[PDB]
Amino acid sequence: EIVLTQSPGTLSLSPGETAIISCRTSQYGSLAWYQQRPGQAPRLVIYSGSTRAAGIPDRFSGSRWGPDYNLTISNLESGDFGVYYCQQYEFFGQGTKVQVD
Amino acid sequence: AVGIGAVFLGFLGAAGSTMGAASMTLTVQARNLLSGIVKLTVWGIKQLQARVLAVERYLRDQQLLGIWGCSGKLICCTNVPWNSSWSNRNLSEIWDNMTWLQWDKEISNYTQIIYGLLEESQNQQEKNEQDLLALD
Amino acid sequence: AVGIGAVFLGFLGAAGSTMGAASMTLTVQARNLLSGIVKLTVWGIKQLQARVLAVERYLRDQQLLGIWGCSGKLICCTNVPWNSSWSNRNLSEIWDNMTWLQWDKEISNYTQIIYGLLEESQNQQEKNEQDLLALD
Amino acid sequence: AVGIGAVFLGFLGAAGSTMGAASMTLTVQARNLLSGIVKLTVWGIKQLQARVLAVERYLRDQQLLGIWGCSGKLICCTNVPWNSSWSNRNLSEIWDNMTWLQWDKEISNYTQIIYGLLEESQNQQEKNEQDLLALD
Amino acid sequence: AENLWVTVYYGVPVWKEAKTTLFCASDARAYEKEVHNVWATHACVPTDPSPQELVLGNVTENFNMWKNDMVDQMHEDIISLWDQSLKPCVKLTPLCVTLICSNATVKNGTVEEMKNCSFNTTTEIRDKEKKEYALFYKPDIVPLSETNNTSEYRLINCNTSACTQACPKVTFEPIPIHYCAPAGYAILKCNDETFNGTGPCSNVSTVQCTHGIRPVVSTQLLLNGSLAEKEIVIRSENLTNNAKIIIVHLHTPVEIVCTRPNNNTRKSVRIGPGQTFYATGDIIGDIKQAHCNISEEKWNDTLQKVGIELQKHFPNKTIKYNQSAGGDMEITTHSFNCGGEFFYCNTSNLFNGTYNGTYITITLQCRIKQIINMWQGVGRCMYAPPIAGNITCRSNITGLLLTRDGGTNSNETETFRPAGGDMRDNWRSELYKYKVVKIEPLGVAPTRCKRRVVGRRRRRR
Amino acid sequence: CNTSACTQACPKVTFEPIPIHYCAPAGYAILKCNDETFNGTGPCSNVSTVQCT
Amino acid sequence: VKNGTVEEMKNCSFNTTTEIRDKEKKEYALFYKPDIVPLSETNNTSEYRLIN
């Protein structure tokens, strides 16, 4: 029954605005979020809940609500667009794509 | 426990007992800090590495007492008024409850600051152990 | 021998002399115990093996004076009554005959027992380090 | 300098200051001489070569104070009259001028002779440690 | 409030966290045998009759076995102690010769577990050689490539690293070895029998030295260990994390009784001036092959007891065991040393079948090796000389090492498999009770004293 | 080579019976028996202490 | 070298021992210095030796 559900399916956004992504969880454990542009390996964004990976701007941040978790992206640049994956221990989320308008 | 001879593993139950009760039988720890239970191989070099550190640790504790005016005394009152900011001025009511293991958590940040005052306390005597008075 | 300038090999003739004559120039032994006359090879490691134990033995002796209240004093009286079972109560007449090398044979079994009483003697004082007098 | 918390590299500028003023903040050197800044390779053995000598030098200095009757005191009077042959009997007018670094060359030859007299002061106590008064 | 002034007290009993090198002490007069031992020093002499203990009342201290500082300290001691005994012993460089090997024949039969190999070895004088032979009781010798001939072989050391013989003088023994902290430091101990590996312990006690920890080395099963007091205990960093290792403690052991029944004969080969090489020369008895026996009744009870205990953490999931997933020969088979021979036992039935835990003679074929890469993985190469005569072993299994398969298994099932390969997890199952804390007689405490007016003396108060 | 290989004595080092004194460390004292008639065991009634042998 | 030659160094080949001691193989390497002493007691100019 250990499943991670990301929503919504896709984000249609104009560059420069603010957006939020969610990842509900059904088991106790750490979380992390991954950035994948097409044609490259994914990259670590945040881990251990809300802490941050090195070398990434501060615009990426996340919040823990217990069995629910959210990633907030403010002032969305042109390069940030891609596909975002949620991850506990093994178990990955469905993956969602943020796309330009 | 109350006594002296005992064993080093005979009095350390005072780690939970009251500070007042822990202040008795205070010599047994002071005895233990030196000796304890200590071709070339690993243990041989350890008997030089660990042994010299035990002595090196012991001399720092004794020299601080030797400067504060508490040389050779297990208990020693000094001339430093207790600032209430370090802790409330009612520990006399309280130290029948707390153990010494719990007291350190209160003055953890302030301990290094206080040692300056104890130096200053001796330096009242240092200023007052020069010049004129002692015709005796 | 009487005198203190002397040499460590200047006073040890008191090893046969009376305890009274041996009681003077008691400082020269205290000087000698500190350092004395002390690629890698056998003597190089021996200078670390022997030296650290020479320091270690000295600390263990000063450790006991610092607790008994005889810190820094060669001679020292202590608040313990001499039990006649350890020896007859007329040594004041006898120690003009015996040397210290002969006295040790009498208290050989009782020395570890006596150290408990001297510890107890300090803790007649330590029991009196919390109650009344030193409001000053 | 006035102030004794300071640092070892906060007071040592007294090496050029007046010999009288350098007597203040005398505790920082007593603190600094203990430990200071300090697979197997060169530095590893050096931490045993230098560390053990740093301890043994400290013990040699302290035991001289213990024998002379100046145990635990930075300043200490002694019962010895100053012979004018060692130096003129007017240093009270001069330690405001000389620094401690300059005073040493006055008594380079006489220092080992003087230590005998300080010991001789103690036999005025060691003579008076067997006779009468301790019945009190 | 009240009038108060500073006071100094310090031969006080309070401690702080720290880590330091620890002296070793061996039980009884074993230090007199220890001089001729490895996995044991030269020697761990005690000065006082250790161990001794005092219970500290009303003391609660925070423990943790996975961030323990002693386990790393012992592992570096045993590794450093192990290769110091191999330092003066003969090296096996001159044996890397093109071995001509054929079937090893024995009295009215043949043995399938070994090859009869012959080679040109240097005699006393370096300019002549002789045609020696020996039975390397292992077909684990690489055939030599770049040739169609199937009868040329080579010793597997020289592909990666030349090896050193284990001298006959030193004996491999798990002698109990206590650890004693130096003066100024104290070893705590948690007596709480229900301790799961981390968190507060409210029955702390101090000791002069640790108990008789013995440095046994094995994989997939912990032998001759110290049993749990009350019941079976399971210890892991975080059971939900399918990585890490699940160390189990049995409160009553099972007896592994086994042997090397072949009657082998040691042979001395003269590879150099003083350097001597020992190899199995011939078999002087009937052949029966190594094997190990475990009680089917008692072991099957162990999985039933262990299964329900795991099911407490994994509710309503049936616990399945299964064969090892893979790895080297050191971790895919239960490996251990006994009597100077290094066994590698197949675990023929110590894996099999569902064991729900709700209650709704096992024979293990064992291989043997002479060349061993030490258990850390990339360590020193060692050649264990043969031991003449049959061998027999009797040991108490006291704990199981396990690991779990995840994540998308059926929600009502969970599969557990053996593990191993890291020395520290064997010893971390015994050093889980201890800490090392430096005793620090503290900074100031108030008292009712006034200032020391003109240095006046005081006794009372 | 029948029993063990050997090592050369390098020309630099020299085999000499240089006199050597043993000096005990601090805390220990070396006694000496001056009794010229000492047969190897038993009491010696003329003792003296030295820094080194 | 590719459409050229290098003045500094020499292409030297030697027999080297394999994993097994009783067999040897040809091997070569460019010792990038001409500081390899020619071997004496021979009129051949193509035999050299490492100066260690």
3-state secondary structure chain E: CCCCEEEECCCCCCEEECCCCCEEEECCCHHHHHCCEECCCCCCCCCCCCCCEEECCCCCEEEECCCCHHHHHHHHHHHHHHHHHHCCCCECHHHCCCEEEEEEEECCEEEEEEEEEEEEEECCCCCCEEEEEEEECCCCCEECCCCCCCCEEECCCCCCCCCEECCCCCEECCCCEEEECCCCEEEEEECCCCCCCEEEECCEEEECECCCCCCCCECCEEECCCCCCCCCEEECCCCCCCCCCEEEECCCCEEEEEEECCCEEEEEECCCCCCCEEEEEEECCCCCCCEEEECHHHHHHHHHHHHHHHHHHCCCCEEEECCCCCCCCCCCCEEEEECCEEEEECCCCCCCCECCCCCCCEEEEEEEECEEECCCCCCCEEECCCCCCCEEEEEEEEEEEEEECCCCCCCCEEEEEECCCCCHHHHCCCHHHEEEEEECCCCCEEECCCCCHHHCCCCCC
**Residues shown for chain A:** 101
Tokens coding F1: 């080579």
The DSSP H or E segment spanning F43 is none
Give me the amino acid identity at E115: K
Q: Do E340 and E388 touch, CB atoms closer than 8 A?
A: no
Element (H, E) at G44: none
Q: Confirm or reject contact between C114 and chain D (CB < 8 A).
A: no
Distance of CA D95 to the CA centre of its chain: 17
Secondary structure element (H or E) that encloses residue A44, with its range: strand A43-47
- Distance set, CA E192 to CA E186, E199, E229, E366, E434 (Å): 19, 11, 10, 39, 12
Q: Is the peptide bond before E399 cis (omega within 30 degrees of 0)?
A: no
């006035």: which residue's tokens?
D2
CA distance B42 to E78: 9
Length of chain G: 52
Q: Could you tell me which of D113, D52, D32 has the C-alpha nearest to residue D80?
A: D113
Rounded Cα gap, residues E31 and E49, in angstroms? 13
The radius of gyration of chain F from alpha carbons, rounded to an integer in Å, stands at 20
What distances in angstroms separate CA D132 from CA C81, D136, E281, one per listed residue? 19, 9, 90
Closest-CA residue to E364 (of E224, E257, E219, E216): E257
Q: What are E178's strand-pairing partners?
A: E25
CA distance F35 to F20: 23
Strands of the sheet with E129-136, listed across from one edge: E129-136, E109-122, E99-106, E152-154, E142-143
Tell me, what DSSP letter sits at residue D92? Answer: G
The C-alpha R_g of chain C, in whole angstroms, comes to: 19
* CB < 8 Å to E58, chain B: 16-17, 99
Say whether C34 and D63 touch across the interface (CB within 8 A). Answer: yes
- Burial class of B118 by CB neighbour count within 10 A (0 to 12, 13 to 18, 19+): buried
Which residues of chain A come before a gap where C and the next N are over 2.5 Å apart?
Answer: 89
Three-point CA angle E36, E39, E40, nearest 5°: 50
Distance CA D69, CA C73 (A): 8
> Residue A9 sits in which domain range?
4-100
Rounded CA separation C98/B128 (Å): 48
Non-local (6+) Cβ contacts of A55 within 8 A are: none
Does B66 contact D31 at a Cβ distance shorter than 8 Å?
Answer: no
Residues 6+ apart with CB under 8 A from B55: B34, C52, C55, C56, C59, D55
How far is the C-alpha of E204 from the C-alpha of D2, rounded, in Å? 49
Task: Kindly provide the resolution of this structure in angstroms, with one decimal.
Answer: 3.9
Rounded to the nearest angstrom, the minimum Cα separation between E222 and chain A is 29
Mapped onto helix, strand or coil, the DSSP state of residue D96 is coil
The H or E element containing residue C17 is none
- In chain B, % helix, strand, coil (3-state, to 5) comes to 50, 5, 45
Which residues are E218's β-sheet partners? E336
In which residue are the tokens 């004041």 written? C92
Amino acid found at F28: Y
C-alpha distances (whole Å) from E263 to each of C4, C53, C117, D121 are 79, 54, 68, 86
Q: How far is CA E348 from CA D55, E221, E291, E354, in A?
A: 63, 14, 10, 16
**How many residues in chain E?**
461
Token code pair at residue E306: 């262990």
Distances (CA, A) of D32 to A25, C56, C105, D29, E421: 58, 22, 44, 5, 49
Of A19, A17, A31, nearest to A65 (Cα)? A31
CB contact under 8 A, B5 and C119: yes
- Are the C-beta atoms of residues E26 and E160 closer than 8 Å to each other? no
Helix (H, G, I), strand (E, B) or coil at G38: strand
- Give the ranges where chain C is alpha helix by DSSP (H): 8-11, 19-23, 27-32, 42-68, 91-94, 100-103, 111-127
* Burial of residue D2 (number of CB atoms within 10 Å: 0-12, 13-18, 19+): exposed
Would the CB atoms of B130 and D71 count as touching at under 8 Å?
Answer: no
Which residue does chain E place closest to F4, by CA atoms?
E274
**Nearest neighbour of B24 by CB, restricted to C52, C69, C126:** C126
Assess whether the previous peptide bond of A42 is cis (omega < 30° from 0). no
Cβ-proximal residues to E31 (8 Å cutoff; 6+ apart), any chain: E43, E44, E45, E46
Q: How was this structure determined?
A: cryo-EM
Burial of E16 (0-12, 13-18, 19+ CB in 10 A): exposed
- Measure CB to CB from residue D27 to each of B56, B67, B129 and give the nearest one: B67
Distance between C97 CA and the closest CA of chain E, angstroms: 39
Q: Contact B12/E41, CB-based, under 8 Å?
A: no
Question: Which residue among C4, C20, C48 sits closest to D119, beta carbon to beta carbon?
Answer: C4
Would the CB atoms of A89 and E411 count as touching at under 8 Å? no
Per-residue exposure over E221-256, b if at least 16 CB sit within 10 Å of its own CB, e if not: bbbbbbebeeebbbbbbeebeeebbbbbbbeebbeb
Using a CB-CB distance cutoff of 8 angstroms, which residues of chain B are in contact with residue E22? Answer: 46, 50
Q: How far is C32 from chain F (nearest CA, A)?
A: 7
Residues of C in contact with E458 (CB under 8 A): 133-134, 136
Nearest residue of G to residue E96, measured between CA atoms = G20
Query: In angstroms, rounded to a whole number, what is the distance separating the alpha carbons of residues E98 and D136?
Result: 97
Cβ-Cβ contacts under 8 Å, E21 against chain B? 46, 49-50
The DSSP element (H or E) to which A6 belongs, if any, is strand A4-7
User: Any residues with CB less than 8 A from the CB of D2 and at least 6 apart, and which?
Assistant: D24, D25
Q: Does F2 touch chain E (CB under 8 A)?
A: yes
| Separate counts of helices (H) and strands (E) for chain B | 7, 1
Number of neighbouring beta carbons within 10 Å of residue C125: 14
State how beta strands E381-383 and E371-373 pair: antiparallel
Contacts of residue B92 in chain E, CB cutoff 8 Å? 2, 4, 446, 448
CATH number reported for the structural domain that contains residue A66 in this entry = 2.60.40.10
- DSSP, res C101: H
Hey, is B72 helix, strand or coil? coil
For residues E189 and E53, the answer to whether their CB atoms sit within 8 Å is: yes
Answer whether C9 touches F (CB < 8 Å).
yes
- C-alpha E58/C-alpha C71 separation (Å) is 36
Token pair, residue D19, equals 């010999």
User: For tokens 């201290």, what's the residue?
Assistant: E61
Q: State the Cα–Cα distance between residues B35 and B33, nearest whole angstrom.
A: 6
Which of C18, C56, C75 is the best mutation test for D, with the most CBs of D within 10 A? C75
All partners of chain A with 3 or more CB pairs under 8 angstroms: E
* Residue F24 in tokens: 């005990």
Does residue E254 contact residue E204 with C-beta atoms inside 8 Å? no
Long-range contacts of D43-47 (CB under 8 A, 24+ apart): none
Q: How far apart are the first and last CA of chain C?
A: 46
**G20 CB near a chain E CB, below 8 Å?**
yes
Give how far Cα F17 sits from Cα of E271, E435, F14, Å. Answer: 39, 55, 10
Show the tokens assigned to B46. 């350890």
Phi-psi region of D41 (alpha: psi -120 to 50; beta: other; left: phi over 0): beta
Question: How far is Cα E229 from Cα E193, in angstroms, rounded to an integer?
Answer: 6
Q: Which two tokens stand for residue E263?
A: 């009657």
Count of residues for chain C?
A: 136
Lookup: tokens for E114:
């070994």
**Would you say E445 and B114 are in contact if contact means Cβ atoms under 8 Å apart?**
no
Residues E50-80: b if buried by 16+ CB within 10 A, e if exposed: bbeebebeebebebebbebbbbebbbebbbe
Q: Which of E229, E66, E178, E353 is nearest to B43 (CA)?
A: E178
Instruction: Assess contact for F42 and F33: CB atoms under 8 A.
Output: no
Separation CA F23–CA A26 (nearest Å): 77
What span, in angstroms and rounded, lies between the C-alpha atoms of C48 and F25?
11
- Residue C128 has what DSSP assignment? T
In Å, what is the CA distance from C44 to each residue of D54, D71, F20? Answer: 18, 34, 16
Q: Is E98 in Cβ contact with G23 (below 8 Å)? A: yes
E149 bridge partner residues: none
The distance of Cα E353 from the centroid of its chain, to the nearest Å, equals 28
CB atoms within 10 A of CB E312: 9
The CA-based angle G23-G27-G30, given to 5 degrees, is 155
d(CA E365, CA E254): 18
In chain F, the residue whose alpha carbon lies closest to the alpha carbon of C13 is F48
In this structure, the strands spanning E15-17 and E5-8 are: unpaired
**Tokens 């100046």, residue located:** D70
Which residues, including other chains, have CB under 8 Å from residue B23's CB and lie 6 or more apart? B75, C129, C130, E9
Contacts of E373 (CB under 8 A, 6+ apart): E330, E379, E381
Residue G12, H or E segment:
strand G10-17
- What are the Cα distances from residue E234, in Å, to D104, E197, E245? 72, 9, 10
Domain count, chain A: 1
DSSP H helix total and E strand total for chain G: 0, 4
| Burial track E404-433 (b if 16+ CB lie within 10 A, e otherwise) | beeeeeeeeebebbbbbbbbebbbbbbbbb
Q: Are A11 and A19 in contact (CB under 8 A)?
A: yes
In total, chain D counts a number of residues equal to 136
What is the Cα–Cα distance from A69 to A84, expressed in whole angstroms? 14
Q: Give the Å distances, CA to CA, from E186 to B103, E28, E224.
A: 20, 22, 27
* Nearest alpha carbon to residue C118 among D116, E440, E339, B4: B4
Euclidean distance between CA atoms B113 and E99, whole angstroms: 76
Sheet with E371-373, strands from edge to edge, namely: E164-165, E381-383, E371-373
Cβ atoms E283, E106 nearer than 8 A: yes
- E13, E21, E23 member nearest B12 (Cβ): E13
Structure tokens at E26: 């061996």
Return the structure tokens found at D37. Answer: 């800044």
Do the beta carbons of residue D72 and residue B126 sit within 8 Å? no
Other Cβ atoms within 10 Å of A32 Cβ, number: 20
Query: B-D interface: how many C-beta pairs under 8 angstroms?
Result: 52
Which residue in A30, A61, A89, A82 sits closest to A53, CA to CA?
A61
| Interstrand relation of E381-383 and E164-165 (parallel, antiparallel or unpaired) | parallel
The residues with which E103 forms a beta bridge, in sequence order, are E115
Q: Do A91 and E407 touch (CB under 8 A)?
A: yes
- The strands making up E5-8's β-sheet, listed across from edge to edge, are B76-81, E5-8, E445-447
- Close Cβ partners of G40 (under 8 Å, ≥ 6 residues apart): none
Nearest to E261 by CA among E366, E168, E361: E366
Dist CA A36 CA D128 (whole Å): 92
3-state secondary structure of D2: coil
Residue E352 near residue E305, CB atoms below 8 Å: no
- C121 DSSP 8-state letter: H
Name the one residue in this structure whose structure tokens are 């503290």.
E442
Question: Does the beta-carbon distance from C123 to B4 stay under 8 Å?
Answer: yes
Other CB atoms within 10 Å distance of the CB of residue E401: 23
Q: What is the dihedral of CA E346, E349, E350, E351, to 10 degrees?
A: 100
| Cα angle value E366/E368/E369 (rounded, 5°) | 150
Rounded distance between C-alpha atoms, residue B102 and residue C134, angstroms? 26
Q: Which helix (H) or strand (E) holds B61?
A: helix B42-68
